[PDB]
């Protein structure tokens, strides 16, 4: 179960400077390349140390490619001012995600290519890769234009053709970084919330990759409906962190067990309060 | 629709030549290409928006200008003998793999001196006249010859407009002499039309030589025709 | 040069088949259109083909593609005199600037 994606964003600027184009590439959700219009010498730059391999032509060709995209984006924004009839003073966001998930048989399992305008679904290539879906009346013009110019065929040829090829190349090229994971470490804390009740908290720290599960149980029973839980966050070192918490009566805190599941954990971790 | 002008220009070396283009395709990319001998398309300059431009593969000696979105222009500061060629404007939509749309073209003769620029001369031959008897339509030939350099456009006006139909008009010059070209074209038209005297037939050309500005009877941007009526 | 076109110049009889060839040196190139130039007029797109297809066929024009030897070609079947033009083979990668060949000048001599 693998993927590659390219998330590109373009933002209008009223005044002199032109739209902003930023393109970032992720492999298995982990940033590997990036390119910013607002840089001084704007080029595609690697972001993982394993992309240091690729020869100066790689950079040059993707750079010039992306300047291609910058303009493609510039124009596409202005077109959309006309379709919706918007005034001159404004800022506007065009964004695009596009990619290819792979089966383990090194085989295209689904392709993605879609756009959005003011963070709303504009248009998107259906699963077939021969048919689009278009949201509001304006998208129905762009489908028109792209059904006339046989756009489907050419994306398709990248998604199946070129994208999949390069996902392999990257994977093999960057192998000693795709192994890496960090097991979480974890402790429990005791914060006397009310007169009568306390708050225990299961802290998970220093773990990569991102996904994780925290479960407070009371005598073999989960309390998911009662607990408080905070969406995982990044520490900054590249690790992550996340905790969960439950309300218990004073004195009876030794019933309550918390558990932590993680890829990096060989065996799952189970926790208890101690004074 | 792409449209260039001028369609043809003659220039003395060290002279200033400016060729303009214009596109209502609403495109943003615009390209000045150079064709040599009818052979190759080589990029000189291009432009992805007004008011900036970029060097192509053949940038040396050419300057470029994108005043408006619709208007893109090539400038030859000092014309040279190399720069003599056919020139092509084209627009295209931004993004990959879009089709370029081309202008009809611009031919440029750059010459050392305006010493050899000779207009044409123009023969209208009235029909075969065995063809009436054979298969019954009149194939009136025109012919321009002894004109250098080959910047001629053969129009066949009637009493009103000019019928494009029935006009096998040649593809190019024939290099008659080193410094002389030839060009013929043959309207064919009706038995009734051209039996009946009450018809007007005119061969016309325009020779692009000098202008009044650009600087022997002054060989400037002329017309030369040759006329006729029906034989009853 | 980057796109090679041969022959330079060609005359063939009405009714014939005609074969224009083309060879390219950027293995990475993807998409190949063909322009048609009738004299008095600027070029115009005739037919085009991606590197995933092996042939594209547009009704008495048909283009063939070959990766191994990095070569491709255009076949006119009936070859009548309304086909007398210059033909350009074109090549590009990604969204890069279309690269144009030198041209082949096709004269379809009519039959008499």
């Amino acid at each position: 179960p693998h993927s590659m994606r390219y998330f590109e964003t373009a933002v209008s600027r009223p005044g002199l400077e032109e739209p902003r184009y930023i393109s970032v590439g992720y492999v298995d959700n982990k940033e590997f390349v990036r390119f910013d219009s607002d840089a001084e010498n704007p080029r595609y730059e690697p972001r993982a140390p394993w992309m240091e391999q690729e020869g100066p032509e790689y950079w040059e060709r993707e750079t010039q490619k992306a300047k291609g995209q910058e303009q493609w984006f510039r124009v596409s924004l202005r077109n959309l001012l006309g379709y919706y009839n918007q005034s001159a003073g404004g800022s506007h966001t065009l964004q695009q995600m596009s990619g290819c998930d792979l089966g383990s048989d090194w085989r295209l399992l689904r392709g993605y290519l879609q756009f959005a305008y003011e963070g709303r679904d504009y248009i998107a290539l259906n699963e077939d890769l021969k048919t689009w879906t278009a949201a509001d009346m304006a998208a129905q013009i762009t489908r028109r234009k792209w059904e006339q110019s046989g756009a489907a065929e050419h994306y398709k040829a990248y998604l199946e053709g070129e994208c999949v090829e390069w996902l392999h190349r990257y994977l093999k090229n960057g192998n000693a970084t795709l192994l890496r994971t960090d097991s979480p470490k974890a402790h429990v804390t005791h914060h006397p919330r009310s007169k009568g009740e306390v708050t225990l908290r299961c802290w998970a720290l220093g773990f990569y990759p991102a996904d994780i599960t925290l479960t407070w149980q009371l005598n073999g029973e989960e309390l998911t409906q009662d607990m408080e839980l905070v969406e995982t966050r990044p520490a900054g070192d590249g690790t992550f962190q996340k905790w969960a918490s439950v309300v218990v009566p004073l004195g009876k805190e030794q019933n309550y067990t918390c558990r932590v599941y993680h890829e990096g954990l060989p065996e799952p971790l189970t926790l208890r309060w101690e004074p | 629709a792409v449209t260039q002008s001028p369609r043809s220009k003659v220039a003395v070396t060290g002279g200033k030549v400016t060729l303009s283009c214009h596109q209502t395709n609403n495109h943003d990319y615009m390209y000045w290409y150079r064709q040599d001998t009818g052979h190759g398309l080589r990029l000189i300059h291009y432009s992805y928006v007004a008011d900036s431009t970029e060097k192509g593969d053949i940038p040396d000696g050419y300057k470029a200008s994108r005043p408006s979105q619709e208007n893109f222009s090539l400038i030859l500061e000092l014309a040279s003998l190399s720069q003599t060629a056919v020139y092509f404007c084209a627009s295209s939509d931004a993004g990959g793999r879009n089709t370029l749309y081309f202008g009809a073209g611009t031919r440029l003769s750059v010459l050392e001196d305006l010493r050899n620029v000779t207009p044409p001369k123009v023969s209208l031959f009235e029909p075969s006249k065995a063809e009436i008897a054979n298969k019954q339509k009149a194939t009136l030939v025109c012919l321009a010859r002894g004109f250098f350099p080959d910047h001629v456009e053969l129009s066949w006006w009637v009493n009103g407009k000019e019928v494009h139909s029935g006009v096998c008009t040649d593809p190019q010059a024939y290099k008659e002499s080193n410094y002389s070209y030839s060009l013929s074209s043959r309207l064919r038209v009706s038995a009734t039309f051209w039996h009946n005297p009450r018809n007007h037939f005119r061969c016309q050309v325009q020779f692009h030589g000098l202008s009044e500005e650009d600087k022997s009877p002054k060989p400037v941007t002329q017309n030369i025709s040759a006329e006729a009526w029906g034989r009853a | 040069q980057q796109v090679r076109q041969s022959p330079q110049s060609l005359t063939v009889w009405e009714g014939g088949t005609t074969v224009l060839t083309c060879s390219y040196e950027d293995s990475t190139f993807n998409y190949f259109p063909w322009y048609q130039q009738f004299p008095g007029e600027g070029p115009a797109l005739l037919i085009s083909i991606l590197s995933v297809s092996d042939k594209k066929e547009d009704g008495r024009f048909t283009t063939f593609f070959n990766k191994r030897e990095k070569k491709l070609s255009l076949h006119i079947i009936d070859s009548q005199p309304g086909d007398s033009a210059t033909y350009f083979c074109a090549a590009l990668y990604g969204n890069e600037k279309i690269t144009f060949g030198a041209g082949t000048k096709l004269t379809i001599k009519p039959n008499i």
Binding site: Y6, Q69, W72, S98, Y158 | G95, G96 | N95
Partner: peptide, 9 residues
């Protein structure tokens, strides 16, 4: 390798 786009909207 990055997506290249074709026809403007």
């Amino acid at each position: 390798k990055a997506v290249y786009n074709f026809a403007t909207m």
